[PDB]
C-alpha cells in the first residue's frame, strides 16, 4: 500500500525474504532492504559457509574475470538470492530488480523512515526453536567482506541517535495520552465511543 | 547492473529514450514535416497523392529537389490540364 516499503532485514530468512521481495518487485512495488548484515539463514554456520565456498569454487577456467562473480557483502548475498528468483535476463526482470535497493546498516534517508518486517520470512515465526541458524554478517566476514566493524560502529551510532529520538517521542506521546484521557469523558468523546472510536 | 545494483539502469535508459524520442517527434511536428490532420484543408485523404502533381502546382504557385518533376512529366501535366480546362469550358 506504501509507495516504498523499507524492510528491516534483521531476523529474516534469506530465501523466504528473497522470494517475498521478488514477488513484490515483479508486482510493481518498490522495496528497500536495510540491515542486510543481520539477515538469517537456516542451518549451522559451518554448513552455510561450506555452501558459500561451493559457490566460490565456480569460475570461468580460462579467464576468471568473466566467471561467476562472488559478491561478498550481505546485501549482495541477499541480492544474489533474489536475482535467482527473477528472470533477470529480460527487460521485465531487469525493470523489477531496479525497484529494489539493498543496504548494510541503515544509511540515510531510511534511518528516518519506518521499517517493516515480513512475518512469513521472519526466522522467529518460521524456523523451529532449537534449530541452528546463520547470521549473514558473520558469513560475509568469514568469506571476505571487510566492513563488518564499520557497519557495527555506524549502527551503534545510529542506535544512540534513534534512542534519543524515541525518548523524545515517548515523552510527547505521554503528553498526548494525558490530553486525550483528560478529554476522554466529554460529550464528544462519548459520542465517538458510540461509534467505535 | 552488477557494479551499481542500486541505480536503475534499464529504467533510466528507457526514461531517457522516451524523453529524447518524443522531443525529436515534437521537433519534427513543429517543423511540419509530419502530414496534417485528416480534417485539415491541407490534407489529401481521399484524394490521389502525386509527387509530380504537387511539384507542378508548387512551381505554378510561385526547395526540395529529391522530389523532382521531369520536363517530360511537366509537359504531360500541362497537356492534361489543357484537356481538363477544355472539358470545364464545354461544361460552362
Amino acid at each position: 500500500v506504501e509507495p516504498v516499503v523499507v524492510i528491516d532485514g534483521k531476523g529474516h530468512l534469506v530465501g523466504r525474504l528473497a522470494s517475498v521481495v521478488a514477488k513484490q518487485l515483479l508486482n510493481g512495488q518498490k522495496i528497500v532492504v536495510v540491515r542486510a548484515e543481520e539477515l538469517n539463514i537456516s542451518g549451522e554456520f559451518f554448513r552455510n559457509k561450506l555452501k558459500y565456498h561451493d559457490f566460490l569454487r565456480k569460475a570461468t577456467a580460462f579467464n576468471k574475470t568473466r566467471g561467476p562473480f562472488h559478491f561478498r557483502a550481505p546485501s549482495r548475498i541477499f541480492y544474489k538470492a533474489l536475482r535467482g528468483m527473477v528472470s533477470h535476463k529480460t527487460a521485465r526482470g531487469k525493470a523489477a530488480l531496479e525497484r529494489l535497493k539493498v543496504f548494510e546498516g541503515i544509511p540515510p534517508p531510511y534511518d528516518k523512515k519506518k521499517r517493516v518486517v515480513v512475518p512469513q520470512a521472519l526466522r522467529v515465526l518460521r524456523l523451529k526453536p532449537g534449530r541452528k541458524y546463520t547470521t549473514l554478517g558473520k558469513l560475509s566476514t568469514s568469506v571476505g567482506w571487510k566492513y563488518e566493524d564499520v557497519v557495527a560502529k555506524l549502527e551503534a551510532k545510529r542506535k544512540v541517535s534513534s534512542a534519543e529520538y524515541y525518548a523524545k517521542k515517548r515523552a510527547f506521546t505521554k503528553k498526548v495520552a494525558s490530553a486525550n484521557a483528560t478529554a476522554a469523558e466529554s460529550d464528544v468523546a462519548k459520542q465517538l465511543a458510540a461509534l467505535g472510536y | 547492473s552488477k557494479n551499481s545494483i542500486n541505480r536503475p539502469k534499464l529504467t533510466s535508459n528507457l526514461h531517457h529514450k522516451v524523453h529524447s524520442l518524443n522531443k525529436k517527434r515534437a521537433q519534427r511536428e513543429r517543423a511540419g514535416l509530419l502530414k496534417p490532420a485528416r480534417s485539415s484543408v491541407n490534407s489529401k485523404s481521399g484524394e490521389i497523392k502525386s509527387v509530380a502533381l504537387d511539384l507542378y502546382f508548387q512551381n505554378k504557385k510561385n526547395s526540395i529537389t529529391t522530389r523532382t518533376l521531369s520536363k517530360k512529366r511537366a509537359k504531360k501535366i500541362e497537356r492534361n490540364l489543357k484537356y481538363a480546362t477544355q472539358r470545364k469550358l464545354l461544361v460552362d
Partner: peptide
Amino acid sequence: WRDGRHHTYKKAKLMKQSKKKTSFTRF
C-alpha cells in the same frame, strides 16, 4: 553546507540524479 558553490553543485547533482532516475540512495 560548505559554501554556495558546493550548495548549488550538490543541489544540481541530486536533482539531475532524481530527474534521470539514477540515484543509488533514493528512487
